[PDB]
Write a protein that binds this DNA or RNA. Structure first.
Ligand SMILES: Nc1ncnc2c1ncn2[C@@H]1O[C@H](COP(=O)(O)OP(=O)(O)OP(O)(O)=S)[C@@H](O)[C@H]1O
Ligand SMILES: Nc1ncnc2c1ncn2[C@@H]1O[C@H](COP(=O)(O)OP(=O)(O)OP(O)(O)=S)[C@@H](O)[C@H]1O
Ligand SMILES: [Mg+2]
Ligand SMILES: [Mg+2]
Lengths: 333, 123, 333, 113
DNA sequence: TTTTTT
């Protein structure tokens, strides 16, 4: 009687909306396969575990920020290399003009297949990202240091000229124009942010991020990467002990954190994370500093265990499969 | 005197500078002059009279001595307690028999003093 | 099938961006010769080896800082002299108003070809730096003591007035506007910084560089230069032993350190570096306090051996060619 | 808000009366350590709203034979208990047949200098 | 929105 009329009206409205705006304009959420979350590797197993879903989501906006020499660009290049190893196409909009192609090649990035752009202005950078997203042939775009996304008016202006919130307005407009395009193209955009200090904050952390507030709202995952120690070979510092805290997460539980090592010229120590997580899951027995697998003493200490694991890839693959199976909160399909 | 968030009287809680409101209190009534107010959340400081729900008036400084009641922030989490610094270790002693002092390993954890407790106002 | 469509869409996107923004706006990282890192000598062989790439990267940003009378100005003047020896043009934005033309000429700088400017405000200094970068005729710019880069409002105001982080805003805007111009122009900008105390720090080294956090993020290379002792000709203190730690490096491995001698009136003692690096590579035999070369006992004591090296250019040329071959990790040619 | 003496537990203080419910009428210094369990300490200013009718359970500022005190009121016929908040102290039993007991107002807030 | 200073 009444419910039948309501169903007829709802079906008529649905058909009208589909006719007006397209086949995929409106549909039931349970039958919409475009809204599924597809994740991509971060190059760090511990970070993949911390993200919950198994890596950074595709088609979303992800922000990575931290203090100086914390490993933002290196982590990002690891993400890009992991993307390229599956055959995806990636782009790097280097707004700092501080990308080293040789170091990028050392991390596992195929430089010959990486699109690199050095934009003159922030508007040009954001437009390049917009065009790449609309193309649909690029799976990951990274924008280096949205603190370097200087507006055209500011570039044409003079030093000391006041451009109140112009960069924030441009960033908000870009995020508005980019969210839907990235969702449609199934393209992951990673914005690298710099850390500034806010003045006049009377309580709490004075550390703010550049680019205004729109990037905070539109980013599905926000990472705070920090350098927490030095990996020293006695007297020579050979790496960095780095902690990444997932300050925002729209695809899993937030605030989980990961710890790993970035070794200069090699990138993220995947095998070190592997040994540590195998120890965490009772898959590698750690008697003090003695690491052993299934009784067989693989070595003494993190470095020796990593070397042994590198010498024995099969055990590495087995432990990685087990760790991904257990510790992942939201295992991807 | 603005109210700019909450402070944990116990296990530290993350807190943000949210200006909930401005209260009509003469800041000069406290020595030193109070800079802001914090909504106390806990009972680790009730021995001196700082109860849960009252407003602790804080004077924004960075240097404090041992035995003072201070509002500190360890790894982005704020708390209020009596300070005791010994080299690379810190102790934020509460005023409560049921609570235990909170040790801060000043070699791995970020620790920043965020002011000095200079009075309490209750509504 | 789908791969060809992806390639066609990617080609269309690259054509669109190239037509919209310029020929070199976007292209693959492999065939971008503008992104190659090319460096110049810093005046110290040990510092060149410590930097990894063999010098300071052109088109990038370098921040040199240390305590009082640690040799920052002398180091930058030595870099300027080395650049001028290669036909390059250099500018000195003397913001501290403490430059001596006589001493600069003593160190080897051709004063007649050094564009020296004494800005009245920090904005004037940074506008001059931007103009010099955009001109393209200046290969090295040295901004002395960015602590002296005072904003115009601070100058017009009275002493004791609070300008809450105005120089930080000025420096952030300057770096934003300057990074791209420096990269496009292939100009090396060296910011000399001072050291200030951190009030109420708890853990360690309450050292801070003036000018805010922008320079930490934007400087490709950051040097901590300190005086560790005196070099005496009997009882006359004739030089200073100086240690430079590469705190931040974007072109090679960081945290390496170098030690040299700054002789008053001569600058960097190059031949002492030559002797020490030859000894380190077994090129010069060291028997106690005696140095020998290829059997020939060359002297006793560091000073007398270096005096030998002064006496005969030929063996100095041999040993410098060899050590440059064995220790320079990234030789250009 | 005026200060008009002490309390057995001088200046105009720039405090908004509306911050207290009911609105505070005058402030009293505290002399004593018996009100400690509910946060009222020695030396603080306690806020009082001038009224005459109260019920049980509230912490009230009473005047017993011209002597001023603050405690929790418990009325039972002709027997009043001004319960304190402290273990070392004992309650003050007002036999409401021989002593004049006057309610002066309600404790509605505390202020510490 | 934008930025530390000793
Ligand atoms: N070419 C290189 N070779 C070796 N190590 C490098 C190289 N470039 C940077 N590093 C180091 O690798 C680590 C990762 O830092 P990066 O990711 O390059 O810098 P960042 O984290 O992006 O911060 P910024 O933007 O440079 S301030 C740091 O400890 C760097 O010093
Ligand atoms: N005209 C000069 N002749 C000889 N030695 C000098 C002269 N000027 C400075 N020196 C010394 O040379 C060393 C190098 O210091 P500088 O060249 O002044 O650079 P600096 O370490 O940054 O000192 P600043 O800029 O004044 S804080 C110091 O030991 C100075 O005392
Ligand atoms: Mg970076
Ligand atoms: Mg100088």
């Amino acid at each position: 009687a009444i419910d039948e009329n309501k169903q007829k009206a709802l079906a008529a409205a649905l058909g009208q909306i589909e006719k007006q705006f397209g086949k995929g304009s409106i549909m039931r959420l349970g039958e919409d396969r475009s809204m599924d979350v597809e994740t991509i590797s971060t190059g760090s197993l511990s970070l993949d575990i911390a993200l919950g879903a198994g890596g950074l989501p595709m088609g979303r906006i992800v922000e990575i920020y931290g203090p100086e020499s914390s490993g933002k660009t290196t982590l990002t290049l690891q993400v890009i290399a992991a993307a390229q190893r599956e055959g995806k196409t990636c782009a790097f909009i280097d707004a700092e003009h501080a990308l080293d192609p040789i170091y990028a090649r050392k991390l596992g990035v195929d430089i010959d297949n990486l699109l690199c752009s050095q934009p003159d202005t922030g508007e040009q950078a954001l437009e390049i990202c917009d065009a790449l997203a609309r193309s649909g042939a690029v799976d990951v775009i990274v924008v280096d240091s949205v603190a370097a996304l200087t507006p055209k008016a500011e570039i044409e202006g003079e030093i000391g000229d006041s451009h109140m919130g112009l960069a924030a307005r441009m960033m908000s407009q870009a995020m508005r124009k980019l969210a839907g395009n990235l969702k449609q193209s199934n393209t992951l955009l990673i914005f690298i942010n710099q850390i500034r200090m806010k003045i006049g904050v009377m309580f709490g952390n004075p550390e703010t991020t550049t680019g205004g507030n729109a990037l905070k709202f539109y980013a599905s995952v926000r990472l705070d990467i920090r350098r927490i120690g030095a990996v020293k070979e006695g007297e020579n510092v050979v790496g960095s002990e780095t902690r990444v805290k997932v300050v925002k997460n729209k695809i899993a539980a937030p605030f989980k954190q990961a710890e790993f090592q970035i070794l200069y010229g090699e990138g993220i120590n995947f095998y070190g994370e592997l040994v540590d997580l195998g120890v965490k899951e009772k898959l590698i027995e750690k008697a003090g500093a003695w690491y052993s697998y299934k009784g067989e003493k693989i070595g003494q200490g993190k470095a020796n265990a990593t070397a042994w694991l590198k010498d024995n890839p099969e055990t590495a693959k087995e432990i990685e499969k087990k760790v991904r199976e257990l510790l992942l909160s939201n295992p991807n399909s | 005197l603005p109210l700019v968030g909450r402070v944990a009287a116990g296990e530290p809680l993350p807190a943000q500078q949210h200006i909930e409101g401005h209260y009509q209190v003469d800041p000069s009534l406290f020595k030193p002059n109070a800079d802001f107010l914090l909504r106390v959340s806990g009972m680790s400081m009730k021995d001196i009279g700082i109860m849960d729900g009252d407003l602790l008036a804080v004077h924004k400084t960075q240097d404090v001595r041992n035995g003072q009641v201070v509002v500190a922030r360890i790894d982005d989490e704020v708390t209020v307690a009596r300070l005791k610094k010994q080299g690379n270790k810190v102790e934020l002693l509460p005023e409560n028999s049921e609570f235990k002092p909170i040790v801060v390993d000043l070699r791995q954890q970020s620790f920043t003093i965020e002011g000095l407790a200079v009075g309490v106002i209750r509504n």
